[PDB]
């Protein structure tokens, strides 16, 4: 389907290294990994989307 989720039940903020994975949020914002954009997410409170992958 089309629709994306990065969980950070996995990838939590404390495992955010050498591993460099950017991404674009529903809001057009720039990621550098899944702790990133959870990061943002959190700011959100989960309202934010994964627009895509890579960068924005």
């Known amino acids: 389907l089309a629709?994306?989720?990065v969980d950070c039940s996995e990838y939590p903020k404390?495992?955010?290294t050498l591993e460099y994975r950017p991404l674009?949020?529903?809001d057009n914002?720039?990621?550098?990994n899944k702790c990133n954009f959870?990061?943002?997410?959190?700011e959100s409170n989960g309202t934010?989307?994964?627009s895509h992958f890579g960068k924005c």
Do not use: M
């Open 48 to 50: 934010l989307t994964l």
């Open 38 to 42: 959870c990061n943002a997410v959190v």
């Open 24 to 26: 674009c949020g529903s």
């Open 29 to 32: 914002k720039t990621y550098g």
């Open 3 to 5: 629709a994306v989720s």
């Open 14 to 16: 404390d495992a955010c």
